């Protein structure tokens, strides 16, 4: 046995423990004894009088004042390596797939320093996704940070599932998925989807190329506040200990911040604006700065980002924009039109959208698409009163192309077949640029709008128009 403490207070997820000798440092993991199962507590503060404040990683029902608590003498340690692949872990590294222990040869702390400034990689290369709006307007970067913003039910999860399908399945390094404070039902769905794609194999767990970590809405706030760390900790091992390219998918990183705010008050913090913890930015920074490519190896991170009440100025999503290399913003106004993916072409960006990186062809077409759309948007107020008849032949020629382009941005997702009743499509980058270039040039002003809706490449538009003739 280790040094022993005694529980002095229990208020929801916050537990105070007293140590007669040896006081465990901030972030250390304590094991509470005398329970149905092992309960882990994370040290958050030293209150004084040899007492520490902690957050529980599981329910605190059953705890009693005076129960003994053991300091493990370090932060939460979780399994890393080949042994995690095809398995499902929780925030504290325990298996939750009913498949037995993860007998790994190494473990790693879920709290770690972020890579040094000299260790950053400056190389900028595209990762083509096959999704026309993304690849065109705000392309993702290999080893870059990607964020998918969306209010409730606009399609950020469907988008991340599609990206796993197009990126991870087509070319696997190793992958890590972190389910963070989301739907347990969604965890079962993802799991069976990955079995079908063979990305997870139940027979050779060695042939699995994805590790799964989950702390969903059924878990208390302490666990939802740290599952993100657990997931990225697994990813870091693949980056450093094997170098090879690593994918990290997170649904949803908002929940990290929300969890924190659930217990902030009981940790004795003065609230910040909108009831968020005053440590929002630094909490977020020390996590996010670990999710990065370095000279040692690459991590390509894709994170779904919840937007409360569809307000992107909300502190959580608002502080997230600064940690990204590519932002894909989803809009309800667009979803409402049947336009999927509901990506806002006038509110999505990428730091690689530069003619020196993607070529002037890619740059100018994207820029041309955005220009005709902002011009339509400025025009919308006028036609809302006068109708279209009052516009000039040029003013309405932009209206017609704009609406075509908006439709040509929509796309049948393979993951979405259960909704559309149509087969998914994947469009190569070159084909995207070409296609969109032609429409902006006017080379399709004779085709009908409907021909542009829910298709792949511009050939399909022409072919749909043909199948629309008869």
């Amino acid at each position: 046995a280790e040094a022993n403490g005694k529980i002095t207070q229990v208020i929801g997820a916050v537990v105070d423990v007293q140590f007669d000798g040896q006081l465990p440092a901030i972030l250390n993991a304590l094991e509470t004894e005398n329970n149905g199962k092992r309960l882990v507590l994370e040290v958050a503060q030293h209150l004084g009088e040899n007492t520490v404040r902690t957050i529980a990683m599981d329910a605190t029902e059953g705890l009693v004042r005076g129960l003994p608590v053991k300091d493990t003498g370090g932060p939460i340690m979780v399994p890393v390596g080949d042994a995690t692949l095809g398995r499902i872990l929780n925030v504290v590294g325990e298996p939750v797939d009913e498949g037995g222990p993860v007998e790994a040869t190494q473990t790693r702390a879920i709290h770690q320093q972020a890579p040094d400034f000299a260790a950053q990689a400056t190389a900028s290369e595209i990762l083509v996704t096959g999704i026309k709006v993304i690849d065109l307007l705000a392309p993702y970067s290999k080893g870059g940070k990607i964020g998918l913003f969306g209010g409730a039910g606009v399609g950020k999860t469907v988008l991340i599932m599609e990206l796993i399908n197009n990126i991870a399945k087509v070319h696997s390094g190793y992958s890590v998925f972190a389910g963070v404070g989301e739907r347990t039902r969604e965890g079962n769905d993802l799991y069976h989807e990955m079995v079908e794609s063979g990305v997870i194999k139940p027979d050779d767990l060695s042939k699995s190329q994805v590790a799964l970590v989950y702390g969903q809405m059924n878990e208390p706030p302490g666990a939802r506040m740290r599952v993100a760390l657990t997931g990225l900790t697994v990813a870091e091992q693949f980056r450093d200990a094997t170098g090879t390219d690593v994918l990290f998918f997170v649904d949803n990183i908002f929940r990290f911040t929300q969890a924190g705010s659930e217990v902030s008050a009981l940790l004795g913090r003065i609230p910040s604006a909108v009831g968020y913890q005053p440590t929002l930015a630094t909490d977020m920074g020390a996590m996010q700065e670990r999710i990065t490519s370095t000279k040692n190896g690459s991590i390509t991170s894709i994170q779904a980002v919840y937007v409360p009440a569809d307000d992107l100025t909300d502190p959580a999503p608002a502080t997230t924009f600064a940690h990204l290399d590519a932002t894909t913003v989803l809009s309800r106004a667009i979803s409402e039109l049947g336009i999927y993916p509901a990506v806002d072409p006038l509110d999505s960006n990428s730091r690689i959208l530069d003619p020196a990186v993607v070529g002037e062809e890619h740059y100018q077409v994207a820029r041309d698409v955005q220009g005709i759309l902002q011009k339509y948007k400025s025009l919308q107020d006028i036609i809302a009163i006068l109708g279209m008849d009052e516009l000039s032949e040029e003013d309405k020629l932009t209206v017609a192309r704009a609406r075509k382009i908006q439709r040509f941005l929509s796309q049948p997702f393979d993951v979405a077949k259960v909704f559309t009743g149509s087969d998914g499509v994947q469009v190569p980058l070159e084909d995207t640029i070409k296609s969109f270039k032609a429409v902006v040039a006017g080379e399709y002003d004779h085709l009908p709008e409907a021909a542009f809706y829910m298709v792949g490449g511009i050939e399909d538009v022409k072919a749909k128009a043909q199948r629309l003739a008869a």
């Binding site: 004795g268 003065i270 609230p271 604006a273």
Partner: protein, 48 residues
């Protein structure tokens, strides 16, 4: 185009009238948001 001249004249004046009443309500809600956000922040701080 005479009828349109006087019709769109009236619409312009009606729009200015609506802009005033909307601004007065916007500023009520703006001040109320600040007032209420503060109370929440301060009520939580005084409980510690």
């Amino acid at each position: 185009q005479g009828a349109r001249m006087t019709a769109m004249d009236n619409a312009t004046r009606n729009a200015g009238d609506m802009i005033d009443r909307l601004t007065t309500v916007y500023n009520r809600s703006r001040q109320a948001a600040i007032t209420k956000e503060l109370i929440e922040i301060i009520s939580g701080a005084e409980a510690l």
